[PDB]
């Protein structure tokens, strides 16, 4: 540690004395991060993630910028974890006694908006983004900022900022859901609709797990230890980023093959909220005005 | 303060003893935030900003969501400053001795992307955003994340993260410049082109001042004190947000009046990098294919 770890209790445990060496001191910081079993598990999941993220980068290496940016950051993340995981400021040890994993929240700020940009162009064919895309990004940034602030805070201040994060988060989840519904009815009828369905399940489950891990972790009720929280977070990271990004590359190849073999043939379908989506079709026998009541 | 402020030096200044009351302690945290003159100046500029931001909200209150979101956050910001400016986590007092103004960086994360979204639709007429818009947002988020990490860090770690912020920042500034060039040649020939020119000056000067205030502040070489840094930051805040947002509302009204009186009549002008922009014109005697060599 690069904070004070050696001290003496004096006067029946009522006074703590430390070397006057310029280092900060706090008992709360010295609480254990967890068991050796938790530590072993965390280093394994990290290695798996560093390696798999590096494989994904090379694999994608065989437009497309979103999968690479996230996979690059995940890799960079491990080297910092690997060398300085518990060094400030990968973990912030603050005057109120909290341990805040800035690396995680910073990583979310780097990667989550890019995932949402990817989500807004699942097929990869669009060159533009609507107004709703922008709201998705702004709501998500706020979620992380409130969540980070909550983690840095204590008591009632933590609770309030968490709840604003929850309000921002619901708005994010709701609009993400809207995007996936449009995407499902946009992509061709076969395999493309299977992949999109898989991504929705992956997305809502993995992203939905995050507020839960927060509540359980040191940032909430301290059920999970620091290592415990790391293991959980790396799991849902693999889901939310690596696996989801894999599917996204796969989905985009499938969309590309469809347009190469069949060309870009569109049919307008309307979904009655009442939304309209231009579905990709396979042959020119369809170019009509189809609908679908929900 | 809610950290330890009372201590005794023992053994010829080599041992510090504190009450064992659970509070964290560090000498670095107790350094003064600055002179009383600096404090007075900071409270004045904050009040000016709280009031003026509230005026802007009501004033805009007489599409348009970007001016309100930023002005709302600025207002909320002051109430937190007003009640808990130097309470954790508005300022983070970390184990490495740094004081990091999380409120500022968090505020930047909330407001700067929205300013850039506004910038990407200065006229307010567009319903879509290109790929380049998305890069603008992603580069800017990275800047803040690296800058925040640099502020939280020390020594060579601070320097590296600052430089990545600088690389991200240049990419942001460059693309912002691209947007303003397109915007200038898009808006009508008269007053609209004056306002856009004003915004470019405001934008690059106020945003450009931020890395400079960083280098001078406690986050860098400690030339400026904490209060000193606050005063500077509130000034360029008024420029980057309040004044710029004012012009943006004004610019959008002017664009709206043009389309109401004259309708939406466009002419394609091409700018030889070679870029094409559809300029708004006043009468149907222009609908041609004009160009302009740079
Ligand atoms: C994400 C979109 C779908 C929403 C589903 C969300 C997942 C579960 C959240 C649940 C209830 C909120 C719980 C609020 C309590 C949190 C307060 C806290 O963290 O505890 C602080 C306290 O000071 C320490 O003792
Ligand atoms: C923003 C786009 C246009 C670019 C214009 C930028 C404005 C000026 C930046 C300049 C040089 C960079 C200076 C790099 C030195 C910073 C390192 C530092 O902060 O000092 C840490 C040290 O450890 C404490 O003693
Ligand atoms: C680690 C195994 C995961 C926890 C198993 C329960 C246990 O006690 O295992 C401890 C053993 O000494 C180690 O494998
Ligand atoms: C394989 C090594 C992985 C190093 C990280 C990225 C490669 C991204 C290319 C841009 C270079 C950035 C490297 C960096 O450290 O920033
Ligand atoms: C997002 C980037 C995050 C964490 C910043 C990287 C972690 C910085 C820690 C570097 C450090 O100070 O390590 C000193 C070493 O422990 C001497 O023994
Ligand atoms: C807490 C919920 C607040 C949700 C904050 C998310 C705001 C998203 C947004 O700004 O959307 C603007 C919309 O287009 C307006 O016309
Ligand atoms: C405050 C005035 C800004 C600094 C003026 C220089 C000065 O010394 O003024 C101190 C005086 O006591 C107070 O006005
Ligand atoms: C005038 C009071 C200003 C209070 C802040 C915002 C109004 C924004 C309307 C949404 C309500 C959010 C209020 C909040 O505190 O979050
Ligand atoms: C972005 C939001 C930021 C700062 C969070 C708000 C600042 C939280 C400080 C509240 C607090 O703990 O105040 C205790 C008071 O000082 C008892 O005397
Ligand atoms: C450090 C400079 C790195 C700049 C990081 C900014 C990346 C912006 C971006 O992702 O743009 C993607 C582009 O569209 C690709 O096709
Ligand atoms: C790669 C990392 C990802 C996809 C992280 C996602 C994180 C979230 C969806 C976090 C959500 C939260 C809330 C819904 C409420 C406030 C607490 C948070 C930040 C954990
Ligand atoms: C309302 C707040 C605004 C507009 C803040 C803008 C901040 C910046 C443009 C900061 C830029 C930085 C760099 C260019 C390099 C790294 C250090 C920063 C974060 C100060």
Author numbering:
A (entry chain A), B (entry chain A): 50 to 111, 118 to 295, 296A, 297 to 327, 331 to 352
What are the paper's exact sentences on this?
Channelrhodopsins, light-gated cation channels, enable precise control of neural cell depolarization or hyperpolarization with light in the field of optogenetics. The first crystal structure of a channelrhodopsin has been solved for a chimera between Channelrhodopsin-1 and Channelrhodopsin-2 from C. reinhardtii commonly known as C1C2.4 This chimera with transmembrane helices (TM) 1–5 from ChR1 and 6–7 from ChR2 is more stable in detergent than the parental ChRs and provided the first invaluable insight into the overall architecture of the central ion conducting core. It shares the prototypical seven-transmembrane helical fold of microbial ion pumps and human G protein-coupled receptors. A first constriction of the putative channel, called the central gate which is composed of residues Glu129, Asn297 and Ser102, is found close to the retinal Schiff base and its counterion residues Glu162 and Asp292 (Channelrhodopsin-2 numbering can be obtained by subtracting 39 from the C1C2 residue numbers).
For our room temperature analysis of light-induced conformational changes in C1C2 we purified recombinant C1C2 from insect cells and grew crystals in lipidic mesophases following established conditions and subjected them to serial synchrotron crystallography at the Swiss Light Source, where they diffracted with anisotropic resolution up to 2.6 Å. To elucidate the conformational changes required to fully open the channel, we performed atomistic molecular dynamics (MD) simulations starting from the light-activated structure. As a further control, we performed the same simulations starting from the dark state structure. In both the dark-state and M390b protonation state simulations, the channel remained closed with no K+ permeation events. Even though the central gate and extracellular vestibule in the light-activated structure were more open compared to the dark-state structure, the changes were not sufficient to allow K+ permeation.
